[PDB]
Symmetry: D2
Protein backbone atom coordinates (compact mmCIF):
# COMPACT_ATOMS: atom_id res chain seq x y z
CA UNK A 1 0.00 0.00 0.00
CA UNK A 2 1.18 3.51 -0.80
CA UNK A 3 2.10 6.28 1.61
CA UNK A 4 -0.99 8.16 0.45
CA UNK A 5 -3.04 5.19 1.64
CA UNK A 6 -1.32 5.19 5.05
CA UNK A 7 -1.81 8.94 5.43
CA UNK A 8 -5.55 8.88 4.69
CA UNK A 9 -6.21 5.93 7.02
CA UNK A 10 -4.23 7.46 9.87
CA UNK A 11 -5.82 10.91 9.53
CA UNK A 12 -9.32 9.50 9.06
CA UNK A 13 -9.05 7.60 12.34
CA UNK A 14 -7.73 10.67 14.17
CA UNK A 15 -10.68 12.73 12.94
CA UNK A 16 -13.15 9.95 13.81
CA UNK A 17 -11.79 9.69 17.35
CA UNK A 18 -11.77 13.48 17.71
CA UNK A 19 -15.36 13.83 16.50
CA UNK A 20 -16.72 11.23 18.92
CA UNK A 21 -14.76 12.58 21.90
CA UNK A 22 -15.60 16.24 21.30
CA UNK A 23 -19.09 16.39 22.92
CA UNK A 24 -17.80 14.93 26.19
CA UNK A 25 -14.67 17.08 26.08
CA UNK A 26 -16.69 20.27 25.70
CA UNK A 27 -19.23 19.20 28.32
CA UNK A 28 -16.47 18.59 30.85
CA UNK A 29 -14.89 21.96 30.10
CA UNK A 30 -18.04 23.63 31.46
CA UNK A 31 -17.51 21.93 34.85
CA UNK A 32 -14.72 24.46 35.50
CA UNK A 33 -17.46 27.06 35.85
CA UNK A 34 -19.38 27.83 39.03
CA UNK A 35 -22.41 30.13 38.85
CA UNK A 36 -22.11 29.78 35.05
CA UNK A 37 -22.03 26.01 34.58
CA UNK A 38 -25.51 25.73 33.06
CA UNK A 39 -25.12 28.64 30.64
CA UNK A 40 -21.90 27.06 29.38
CA UNK A 41 -23.51 23.66 28.84
CA UNK A 42 -26.48 25.25 27.09
CA UNK A 43 -24.03 27.10 24.84
CA UNK A 44 -22.30 23.81 23.99
CA UNK A 45 -25.59 22.09 23.21
CA UNK A 46 -27.04 24.98 21.19
CA UNK A 47 -23.89 25.31 19.07
CA UNK A 48 -23.07 21.59 18.85
CA UNK A 49 -23.69 21.52 15.06
CA UNK A 50 -21.20 24.34 14.58
CA UNK A 51 -18.65 22.92 17.02
CA UNK A 52 -18.77 19.42 15.51
CA UNK A 53 -18.24 20.93 12.05
CA UNK A 54 -14.74 21.93 13.23
CA UNK A 55 -13.58 18.34 12.57
CA UNK A 56 -12.80 17.65 8.89
CA UNK A 57 -14.81 14.95 7.15
CA UNK A 58 -13.32 11.76 5.73
CA UNK A 59 -13.65 13.24 2.23
CA UNK A 60 -10.92 15.72 3.26
CA UNK A 61 -8.26 13.10 4.02
CA UNK A 62 -6.79 13.19 0.51
CA UNK A 63 -6.39 16.96 0.23
CA UNK A 64 -4.97 17.05 3.76
CA UNK A 65 -2.40 14.42 2.79
CA UNK A 66 -1.64 16.49 -0.31
CA UNK A 67 -0.87 19.44 1.97
CA UNK A 68 1.52 17.16 3.87
CA UNK A 69 3.02 16.30 0.48
CA UNK A 70 2.18 12.57 0.35
CA UNK A 71 -0.96 12.19 -1.85
CA UNK A 72 -1.34 12.60 -5.61
CA UNK A 73 2.37 13.19 -5.99
CA UNK A 74 3.60 14.31 -9.45
CA UNK B 1 -21.68 38.23 25.45
CA UNK B 2 -18.01 38.09 26.37
CA UNK B 3 -19.13 35.25 28.65
CA UNK B 4 -20.44 33.39 25.60
CA UNK B 5 -17.09 34.16 24.00
CA UNK B 6 -15.46 32.89 27.20
CA UNK B 7 -17.44 29.64 27.06
CA UNK B 8 -16.63 29.12 23.38
CA UNK B 9 -12.88 29.55 23.80
CA UNK B 10 -12.78 27.28 26.85
CA UNK B 11 -14.79 24.43 25.31
CA UNK B 12 -12.92 24.57 21.99
CA UNK B 13 -9.53 24.74 23.70
CA UNK B 14 -10.44 21.61 25.67
CA UNK B 15 -11.54 19.73 22.54
CA UNK B 16 -8.28 20.56 20.76
CA UNK B 17 -6.22 19.52 23.79
CA UNK B 18 -8.12 16.22 23.98
CA UNK B 19 -7.72 15.64 20.24
CA UNK B 20 -3.98 16.35 20.28
CA UNK B 21 -3.41 14.01 23.22
CA UNK B 22 -5.43 11.23 21.56
CA UNK B 23 -3.93 11.50 18.07
CA UNK B 24 -0.93 9.15 18.57
CA UNK B 25 -3.15 6.42 20.00
CA UNK B 26 -5.69 6.96 17.22
CA UNK B 27 -3.07 6.71 14.48
CA UNK B 28 -1.52 3.65 16.15
CA UNK B 29 -4.93 1.97 16.08
CA UNK B 30 -5.20 2.70 12.37
CA UNK B 31 -1.88 0.97 11.66
CA UNK B 32 -2.84 -2.11 13.71
CA UNK B 33 -5.64 -2.83 11.20
CA UNK B 34 -2.92 -3.60 8.65
CA UNK B 35 -1.30 -7.01 8.47
CA UNK B 36 1.76 -7.23 6.23
CA UNK B 37 1.96 -3.42 6.25
CA UNK B 38 1.76 -2.60 9.96
CA UNK B 39 5.46 -1.72 10.02
CA UNK B 40 5.22 0.39 6.85
CA UNK B 41 2.26 2.30 8.29
CA UNK B 42 4.06 2.93 11.58
CA UNK B 43 7.18 4.07 9.72
CA UNK B 44 5.10 6.63 7.81
CA UNK B 45 3.66 7.98 11.06
CA UNK B 46 7.08 8.25 12.69
CA UNK B 47 8.64 10.13 9.78
CA UNK B 48 5.67 12.54 9.54
CA UNK B 49 4.69 12.85 13.24
CA UNK B 50 5.51 16.60 13.56
CA UNK B 51 3.29 17.32 10.55
CA UNK B 52 0.41 15.13 11.73
CA UNK B 53 0.40 16.60 15.25
CA UNK B 54 0.29 20.07 13.66
CA UNK B 55 -3.19 19.27 12.31
CA UNK B 56 -4.76 20.26 15.67
CA UNK B 57 -5.16 24.03 16.19
CA UNK B 58 -3.42 25.72 19.10
CA UNK B 59 -5.14 27.64 21.88
CA UNK B 60 -4.10 30.89 20.19
CA UNK B 61 -6.73 30.04 17.54
CA UNK B 62 -9.68 29.77 19.94
CA UNK B 63 -10.71 33.44 19.69
CA UNK B 64 -10.73 33.71 15.89
CA UNK B 65 -12.43 30.31 15.62
CA UNK B 66 -15.19 31.54 17.93
CA UNK B 67 -15.41 34.68 15.78
CA UNK B 68 -16.11 32.46 12.78
CA UNK B 69 -18.85 30.73 14.81
CA UNK B 70 -20.35 34.16 15.49
CA UNK B 71 -19.90 34.38 19.27
CA UNK B 72 -16.72 36.48 19.87
CA UNK B 73 -17.48 39.83 18.28
CA UNK B 74 -14.66 42.36 18.01
CA UNK C 1 17.20 32.33 4.85
CA UNK C 2 15.50 29.23 6.23
CA UNK C 3 12.73 27.41 4.40
CA UNK C 4 10.59 27.98 7.48
CA UNK C 5 11.03 31.75 7.02
CA UNK C 6 10.07 31.58 3.34
CA UNK C 7 7.05 29.40 4.08
CA UNK C 8 5.67 31.63 6.84
CA UNK C 9 6.14 34.86 4.88
CA UNK C 10 4.70 33.49 1.64
CA UNK C 11 1.61 31.94 3.24
CA UNK C 12 0.90 35.01 5.36
CA UNK C 13 0.98 37.20 2.24
CA UNK C 14 -1.42 34.86 0.46
CA UNK C 15 -3.80 35.04 3.43
CA UNK C 16 -3.60 38.84 3.53
CA UNK C 17 -4.42 38.97 -0.18
CA UNK C 18 -7.31 36.53 0.28
CA UNK C 19 -8.69 38.56 3.18
CA UNK C 20 -8.45 41.71 1.05
CA UNK C 21 -10.17 40.06 -1.93
CA UNK C 22 -12.94 38.27 -0.05
CA UNK C 23 -15.63 41.03 0.07
CA UNK C 24 -15.59 41.57 -3.69
CA UNK C 25 -15.47 37.81 -4.33
CA UNK C 26 -18.52 37.25 -2.16
CA UNK C 27 -20.39 40.14 -3.77
CA UNK C 28 -19.83 38.60 -7.20
CA UNK C 29 -21.05 35.23 -5.95
CA UNK C 30 -24.43 36.81 -5.19
CA UNK C 31 -24.79 37.78 -8.85
CA UNK C 32 -25.42 34.09 -9.59
CA UNK C 33 -28.75 34.30 -7.71
CA UNK C 34 -31.55 35.68 -9.89
CA UNK C 35 -34.30 37.69 -8.16
CA UNK C 36 -32.57 36.92 -4.84
CA UNK C 37 -29.43 38.99 -5.38
CA UNK C 38 -30.21 41.44 -2.58
CA UNK C 39 -31.06 38.67 -0.13
CA UNK C 40 -27.69 37.06 -0.85
CA UNK C 41 -25.89 40.38 -0.44
CA UNK C 42 -27.83 40.95 2.77
CA UNK C 43 -26.54 37.60 4.02
CA UNK C 44 -22.96 38.59 3.16
CA UNK C 45 -23.35 41.92 4.95
CA UNK C 46 -24.88 40.34 8.06
CA UNK C 47 -22.15 37.68 8.39
CA UNK C 48 -19.14 39.64 7.09
CA UNK C 49 -16.98 39.40 10.26
CA UNK C 50 -17.53 35.64 10.48
CA UNK C 51 -16.74 35.12 6.80
CA UNK C 52 -13.61 37.28 7.05
CA UNK C 53 -12.55 35.26 10.12
CA UNK C 54 -12.21 32.20 7.86
CA UNK C 55 -8.84 33.51 6.59
CA UNK C 56 -6.05 32.39 8.95
CA UNK C 57 -4.08 35.04 10.82
CA UNK C 58 -0.32 35.50 10.64
CA UNK C 59 -0.09 33.71 14.00
CA UNK C 60 -1.07 30.51 12.13
CA UNK C 61 1.78 30.67 9.61
CA UNK C 62 4.21 28.60 11.70
CA UNK C 63 1.91 25.70 12.55
CA UNK C 64 0.70 25.61 8.93
CA UNK C 65 4.29 25.42 7.68
CA UNK C 66 4.93 22.71 10.27
CA UNK C 67 2.11 20.65 8.73
CA UNK C 68 3.73 21.17 5.31
CA UNK C 69 6.93 19.80 6.87
CA UNK C 70 9.22 22.83 6.61
CA UNK C 71 9.10 24.34 10.13
CA UNK C 72 10.13 22.17 13.08
CA UNK D 1 -36.83 32.43 -1.49
CA UNK D 2 -33.71 30.28 -1.63
CA UNK D 3 -32.04 29.26 1.60
CA UNK D 4 -29.34 31.06 3.56
CA UNK D 5 -27.36 27.82 3.34
CA UNK D 6 -27.39 28.11 -0.45
CA UNK D 7 -26.13 31.71 -0.30
CA UNK D 8 -23.39 30.72 2.14
CA UNK D 9 -22.09 27.75 0.14
CA UNK D 10 -22.00 29.70 -3.13
CA UNK D 11 -20.33 32.71 -1.52
CA UNK D 12 -17.61 30.69 0.22
CA UNK D 13 -16.90 28.52 -2.82
CA UNK D 14 -16.46 31.71 -4.86
CA UNK D 15 -14.03 33.08 -2.27
CA UNK D 16 -12.00 29.86 -2.23
CA UNK D 17 -11.86 29.70 -6.03
CA UNK D 18 -10.63 33.30 -6.12
CA UNK D 19 -7.97 32.54 -3.49
CA UNK D 20 -6.79 29.43 -5.34
CA UNK D 21 -6.51 31.34 -8.62
CA UNK D 22 -4.57 34.21 -7.00
CA UNK D 23 -2.24 32.18 -4.81
CA UNK D 24 0.62 31.52 -7.28
CA UNK D 25 1.15 35.18 -8.14
CA UNK D 26 0.65 36.27 -4.53
CA UNK D 27 3.35 33.90 -3.30
CA UNK D 28 5.71 34.82 -6.14
CA UNK D 29 5.31 38.49 -5.20
CA UNK D 30 5.81 37.64 -1.52
CA UNK D 31 9.33 36.44 -2.31
CA UNK D 32 10.30 39.93 -3.51
CA UNK D 33 10.35 40.76 0.25
CA UNK D 34 13.54 38.64 0.53
CA UNK D 35 16.40 40.80 -0.66
CA UNK D 36 19.27 38.40 0.10
CA UNK D 37 17.82 35.20 -1.43
CA UNK D 38 14.75 35.96 -3.54
CA UNK D 39 15.50 33.14 -5.99
CA UNK D 40 15.72 30.64 -3.12
CA UNK D 41 12.30 31.80 -1.92
CA UNK D 42 10.85 31.43 -5.42
CA UNK D 43 12.36 27.94 -5.63
CA UNK D 44 10.64 27.01 -2.38
CA UNK D 45 7.32 28.32 -3.72
CA UNK D 46 7.62 26.41 -6.99
CA UNK D 47 8.77 23.16 -5.37
CA UNK D 48 5.95 23.21 -2.80
CA UNK D 49 3.16 24.69 -4.93
CA UNK D 50 1.08 21.46 -4.87
CA UNK D 51 1.12 21.51 -1.06
CA UNK D 52 0.44 25.25 -0.84
CA UNK D 53 -2.51 25.13 -3.24
CA UNK D 54 -4.01 22.29 -1.18
CA UNK D 55 -4.45 24.72 1.72
CA UNK D 56 -7.52 26.19 -0.03
CA UNK D 57 -10.66 24.15 0.79
CA UNK D 58 -12.43 22.43 -2.08
CA UNK D 59 -16.04 23.07 -3.08
CA UNK D 60 -17.07 19.87 -1.29
CA UNK D 61 -16.11 21.65 1.97
CA UNK D 62 -18.65 24.45 1.50
CA UNK D 63 -21.46 22.78 3.45
CA UNK D 64 -19.51 21.93 6.60
CA UNK D 65 -17.89 25.38 6.61
CA UNK D 66 -21.34 26.96 6.42
CA UNK D 67 -22.44 24.54 9.13
CA UNK D 68 -19.64 25.89 11.34
CA UNK D 69 -20.88 29.44 10.68
CA UNK D 70 -24.29 28.17 11.81
CA UNK D 71 -26.23 28.63 8.57
CA UNK D 72 -26.46 25.07 7.17
CA UNK D 73 -28.08 22.51 9.49
Amino acid sequence: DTECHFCKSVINQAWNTSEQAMPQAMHQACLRFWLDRQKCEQFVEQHMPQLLALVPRSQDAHITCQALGVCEAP
